[PDB]
Amino acid sequence: NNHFRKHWQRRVRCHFDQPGKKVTRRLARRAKAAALAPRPVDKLRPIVRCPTVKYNRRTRLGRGFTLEELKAAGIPRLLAPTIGIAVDHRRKNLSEESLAANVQRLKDYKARLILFPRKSNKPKKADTPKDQQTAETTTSLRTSFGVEQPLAPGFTEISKSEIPAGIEGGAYRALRKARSDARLVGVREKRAKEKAEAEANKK
């Protein structure tokens, strides 16, 4: 199975510029870091869980924090993109756990945040005082605020006194039964309505 029946030599792409493009990307990143100093080179990203049943075991960085997450962390939505926080209005919080995890992430970032005043001679109450403005800082939010546990721990120890009893009848039997009711959910309802109609007719 070789697909060479078109004019394939007209659009052959070679990659001799791979090291040069790496050099160009590194120079661009250095320029961006120098322009953005002392801010980090990237924005804070939330922790989200991958879709589909294949990848829902693993978490990763998402686009931005939700408005509910920002409101529960006390960060206004207009201030958030100005202090290194990415905002995503499309994502919603369907469960408490991801919402709470991202809110704690935002609180940790806000606790570690140093905010310089807009005017040096007129500091405000929301700004970091000059005696606390000096510390060891980080320039990579993807490294300092990475996904520490993408997967659940694969090994845990318990005593044999607390071994669970298990599903009555067996796990295999439970799976077969659940599939059986999932396939027969409509038939039972139809026969129940038929029996109810017959009972109403001949009560």
């Binding site: 294949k54 990848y55 090994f155 044999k160 295999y172």
Partner: protein
């Protein structure tokens, strides 16, 4: 290389259903047998369990964290109670885990 070719030596002498929009992520479910089940335990703790230095502790193994969804029943297990968390399990694998003294817990 050109110089090793035979051409240089020869110089001078010349059914069923159709599934529209199939998604493989629906059908992703890797399987592991029970004779590979103890390999998921880290080696030091595994050797301590196999020698018998943990008579008051039972290991809990999550297959989904290791990338497996179904436990299959090829092989045999030692007489150590092991808690196994899995999405799917075969009847023989569950029987052999119960004979070994553990339990198969169903997860999603």
């Amino acid at each position: 290389p050109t110089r090793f070719s035979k051409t240089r030596k020869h110089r001078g002498h010349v059914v069923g259903m159709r599934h529209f929009h199939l998604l493989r992520n629906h059908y992703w479910r890797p399987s592991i047998n029970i004779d590979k089940l103890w390999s998921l335990v880290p080696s030091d703790v595994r050797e301590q369990y196999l020698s018998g230095q943990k008579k008051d502790t039972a290991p809990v193994i999550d297959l989904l964290s290791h990338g497996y969804a179904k436990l299959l029943g090829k092989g045999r297990l030692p007489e150590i109670p092991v808690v196994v968390r899995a999405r799917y399990v075969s009847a023989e694998a569950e029987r052999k885990v119960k004979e070994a003294g553990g339990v198969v817990e169903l997860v999603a």
